[PDB]
């Protein structure tokens, strides 16, 4: 029933299946049930599908362990639409961060490849439905993020935007991703409003395999 979003991100209703290291082809249905429990734009969905058309090697590792990566930001909050058997949760591969009793310092962190394989990384950008969350959590109406590399880089400075109820959510987090090669580095800088990596996807390329929608 899962989406690619529900598969890659760590939806608890989706079996993660780290044991599945590589495979022949991808199987979906046309109308996948489980998109993102907290909705949000997922840019370049097409491109990521085509990049994940094939597998030569693929696996999951812990780029930044939840332990010891973020002492100075409280880490453990989740949301209730993202749930497991009627009990709240959040995507396995990622993290929220918020202050230490309303104590947001701002961040600069980075990582480069030692594994010598190619790497796939995800993150997110927070769009609250109201401002009291913004001031309360992060204590800046200002937003400014800068996710940086050699090839790719981009910044983000969003505001509140009152969207309608979708899965009992007006809020949004827009998801943003990239590939990263051996030798190259990523930096994250931010004044909050982030979804950070817990786990990242190590891989080699593949060739020629691909994707199916099917109910057979």
């Amino acid at each position, epitope marked *: 029933n899962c989406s690619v979003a529900g598969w890659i991100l760590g939806n608890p209703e989706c079996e993660l299946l780290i044991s599945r290291e590589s495979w022949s082809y991808i199987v979906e249905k046309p109308n996948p049930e489980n998109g993102t429990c907290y909705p949000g734009h997922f840019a370049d969905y097409e491109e990521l599908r085509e990049q994940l058309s094939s597998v030569s090697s693929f696996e999951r590792f812990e780029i930044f362990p939840k332990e010891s990566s973020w002492p100075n930001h409280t880490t453990t909050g*989740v949301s209730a639409s993202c749930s497991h058997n*009627g009990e*709240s949760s959040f995507y396995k591969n990622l993290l929220w961060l918020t*202050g230490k009793n*309303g*104590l947001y310092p701002n961040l600069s962190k980075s990582y480069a490849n030692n594994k010598e394989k190619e790497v796939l990384v995800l993150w997110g950008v927070h769009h609250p439905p109201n401002i*009291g969350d913004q001031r*309360a959590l992060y204590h800046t109406e200002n937003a400014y993020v800068s996710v940086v590399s050699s090839h790719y880089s981009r910044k983000f400075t969003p505001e509140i935007a009152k969207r309608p109820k979708v899965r009992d959510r*007006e809020g949004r987090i827009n998801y943003y991703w990239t590939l990263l090669e051996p030798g190259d580095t990523i930096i994250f800088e931010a004044n909050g409003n982030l979804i950070a990596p817990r786990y990242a996807f190590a891989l080699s390329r593949g060739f020629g395999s691909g994707i199916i929608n099917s109910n057979a």
Partner: single-chain antibody
Amino acid sequence: EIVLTQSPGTLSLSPGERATLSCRASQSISGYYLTWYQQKPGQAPRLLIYGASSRATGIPDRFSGSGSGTDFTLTISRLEPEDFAVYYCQQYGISPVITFGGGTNVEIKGVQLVESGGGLVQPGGSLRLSCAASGFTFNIYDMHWVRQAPGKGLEWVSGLTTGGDTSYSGSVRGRFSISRENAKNSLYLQMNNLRAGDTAAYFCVRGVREVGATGGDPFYYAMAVWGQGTTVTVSS
């Protein structure tokens, strides 16, 4: 989580007077971390103040506090005989453990929850409680069960986040056991191996907006709202 120290556990003062109360801990503990309550004996608690400065809903503007680090403080601008009450000091540990100051009487000189099952058992025995929800989404908030002996400092029995990470005290753990139901909009507390330390009043308590949901709900790191509690006792 850290031991607190209220100052004073009771005081006696006259009308048209301020009142300084100081709740201070072992360590320095960062100050959007406490919340402050009142209670009349016979009534359940009520919320007043949070994070050592700031003020709740449905309010005058008289109780106002300050302080930081190790020493937190709530002051009072004016005293009145309607305020005749015990005020409390409740802090959210980073070890996710609420800790409690032992209540502070002011003497003046001249939507809802519902509990279920409170009563008597034999000591060394077994009994369960439930709570049930009314007029909100029991999905969201981070829940706590609490105890209170009569006219004593409170004790925090237990609480649980919606992601399943538990927190008990090391003495109470194993003897009590919780379970939650959001689809039912209700809560459960099966309990075994019960002794006279459990002879006390209890409360079910709705806490904290986890990260994310639709509403006109802010959050604090304070309570959301209490229940009316109920008595539990062992005897023979």
